Structures are given as structure tokens and as C-alpha cells.
mmCIF file with all atom_site columns, C-alpha atoms in Angstrom:
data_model
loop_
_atom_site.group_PDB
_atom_site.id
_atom_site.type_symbol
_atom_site.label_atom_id
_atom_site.label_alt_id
_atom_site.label_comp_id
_atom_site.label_asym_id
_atom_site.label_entity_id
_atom_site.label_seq_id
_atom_site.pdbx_PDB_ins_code
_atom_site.Cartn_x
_atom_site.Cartn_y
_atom_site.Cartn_z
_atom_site.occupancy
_atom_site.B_iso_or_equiv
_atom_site.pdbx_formal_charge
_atom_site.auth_seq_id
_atom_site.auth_comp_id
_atom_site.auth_asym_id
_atom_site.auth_atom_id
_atom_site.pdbx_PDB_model_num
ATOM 1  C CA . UNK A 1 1  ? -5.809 -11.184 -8.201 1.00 0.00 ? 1  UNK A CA 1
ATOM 2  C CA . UNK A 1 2  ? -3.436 -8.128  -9.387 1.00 0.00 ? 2  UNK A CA 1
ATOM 3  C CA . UNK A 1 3  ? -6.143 -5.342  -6.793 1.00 0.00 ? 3  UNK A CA 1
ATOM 4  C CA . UNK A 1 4  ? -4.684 -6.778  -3.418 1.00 0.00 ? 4  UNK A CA 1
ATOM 5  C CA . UNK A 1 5  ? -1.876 -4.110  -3.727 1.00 0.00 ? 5  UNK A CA 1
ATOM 6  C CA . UNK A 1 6  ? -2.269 -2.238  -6.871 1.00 0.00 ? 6  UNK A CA 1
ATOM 7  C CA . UNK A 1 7  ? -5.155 -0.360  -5.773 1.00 0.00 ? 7  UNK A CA 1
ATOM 8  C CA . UNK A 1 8  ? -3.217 0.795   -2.749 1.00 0.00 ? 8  UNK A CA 1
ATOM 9  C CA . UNK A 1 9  ? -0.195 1.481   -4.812 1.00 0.00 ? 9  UNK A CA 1
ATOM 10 C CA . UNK A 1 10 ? -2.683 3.618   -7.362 1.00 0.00 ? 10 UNK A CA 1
ATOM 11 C CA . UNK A 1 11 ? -2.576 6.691   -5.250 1.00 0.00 ? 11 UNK A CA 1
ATOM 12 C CA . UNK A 1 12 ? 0.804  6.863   -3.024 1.00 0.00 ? 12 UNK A CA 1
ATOM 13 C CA . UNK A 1 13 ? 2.272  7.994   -6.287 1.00 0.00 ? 13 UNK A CA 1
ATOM 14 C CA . UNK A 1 14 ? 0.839  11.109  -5.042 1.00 0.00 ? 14 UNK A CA 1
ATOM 15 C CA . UNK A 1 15 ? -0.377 10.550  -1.491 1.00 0.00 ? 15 UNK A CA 1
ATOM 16 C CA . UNK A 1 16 ? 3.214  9.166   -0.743 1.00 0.00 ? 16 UNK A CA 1
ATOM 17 C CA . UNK A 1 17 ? 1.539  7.167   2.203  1.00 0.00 ? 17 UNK A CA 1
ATOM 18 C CA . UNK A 1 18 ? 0.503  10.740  3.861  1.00 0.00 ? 18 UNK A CA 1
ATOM 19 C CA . UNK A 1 19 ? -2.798 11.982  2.773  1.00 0.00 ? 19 UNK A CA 1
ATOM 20 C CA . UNK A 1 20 ? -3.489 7.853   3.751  1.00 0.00 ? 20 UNK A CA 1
ATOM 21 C CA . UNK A 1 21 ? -2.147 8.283   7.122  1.00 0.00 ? 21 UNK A CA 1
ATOM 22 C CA . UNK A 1 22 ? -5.263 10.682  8.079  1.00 0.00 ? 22 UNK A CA 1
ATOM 23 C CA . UNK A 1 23 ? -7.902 8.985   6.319  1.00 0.00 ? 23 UNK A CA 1
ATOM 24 C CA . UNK A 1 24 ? -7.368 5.137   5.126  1.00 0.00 ? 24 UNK A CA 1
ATOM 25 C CA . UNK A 1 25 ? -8.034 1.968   7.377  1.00 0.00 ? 25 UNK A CA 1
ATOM 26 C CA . UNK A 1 26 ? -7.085 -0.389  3.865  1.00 0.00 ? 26 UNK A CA 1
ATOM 27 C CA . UNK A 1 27 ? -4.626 1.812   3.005  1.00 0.00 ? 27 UNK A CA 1
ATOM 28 C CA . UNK A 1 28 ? -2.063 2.430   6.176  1.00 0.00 ? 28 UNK A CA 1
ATOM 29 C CA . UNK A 1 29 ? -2.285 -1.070  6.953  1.00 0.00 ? 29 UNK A CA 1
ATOM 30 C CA . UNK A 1 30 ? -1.628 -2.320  3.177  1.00 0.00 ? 30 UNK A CA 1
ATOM 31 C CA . UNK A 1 31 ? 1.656  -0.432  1.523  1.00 0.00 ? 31 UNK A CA 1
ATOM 32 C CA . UNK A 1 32 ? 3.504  -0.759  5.247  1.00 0.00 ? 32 UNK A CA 1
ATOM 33 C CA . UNK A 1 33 ? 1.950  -3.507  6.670  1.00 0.00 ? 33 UNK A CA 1
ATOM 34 C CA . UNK A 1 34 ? 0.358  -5.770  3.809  1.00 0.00 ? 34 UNK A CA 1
ATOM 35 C CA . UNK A 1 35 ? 3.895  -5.414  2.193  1.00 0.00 ? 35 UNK A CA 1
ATOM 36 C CA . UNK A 1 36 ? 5.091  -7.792  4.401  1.00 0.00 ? 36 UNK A CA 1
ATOM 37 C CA . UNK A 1 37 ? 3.303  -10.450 2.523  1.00 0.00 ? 37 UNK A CA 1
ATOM 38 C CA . UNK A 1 38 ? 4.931  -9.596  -1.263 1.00 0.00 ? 38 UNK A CA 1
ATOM 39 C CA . UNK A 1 39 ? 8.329  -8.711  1.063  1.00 0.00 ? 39 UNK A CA 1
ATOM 40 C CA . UNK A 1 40 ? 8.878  -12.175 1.059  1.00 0.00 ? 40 UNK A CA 1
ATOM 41 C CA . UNK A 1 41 ? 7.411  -13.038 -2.597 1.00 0.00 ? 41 UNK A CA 1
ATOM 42 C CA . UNK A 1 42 ? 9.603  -10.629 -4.381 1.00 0.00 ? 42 UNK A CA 1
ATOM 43 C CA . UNK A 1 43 ? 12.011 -8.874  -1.551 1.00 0.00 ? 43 UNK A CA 1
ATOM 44 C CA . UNK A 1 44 ? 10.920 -5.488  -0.906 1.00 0.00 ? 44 UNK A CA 1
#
């Protein structure tokens, strides 16, 4: 699927990973730590 990250990636354009950081369980957990699993697919 193309949602795993996208979705998560569809609002720090604006939340910036802050907004997230006070309300998100699937969202703090998904640009810093689900990363980790496209980190090694693609490098960042």
C-alpha cells in the first residue's frame, strides 16, 4: 500500500511533527519511529 506513511506525511507539512506530539498515538510513532522501516528502503 502507498497509506502506511503517506497519511502520516499528509499533515506534518503543517503540523511539522508538533501539533502530533500532543495528540497522535499513529502519528509520533510513524514519521520518527516507522521511518526506520523506509530508512533502510530508500535512506532517509
Amino acid at each position: 500500500m502507498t497509506g502506511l506513511a503517506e497519511a502520516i506525511a499528509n499533515t506534518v507539512q503543517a503540523a511539522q511533527q508538533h501539533d502530533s506530539v500532543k495528540l497522535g498515538t499513529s502519528i509520533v510513532d510513524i514519521v520518527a519511529n516507522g521511518v526506520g522501516l523506509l530508512g533502510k528502503l530508500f535512506g532517509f
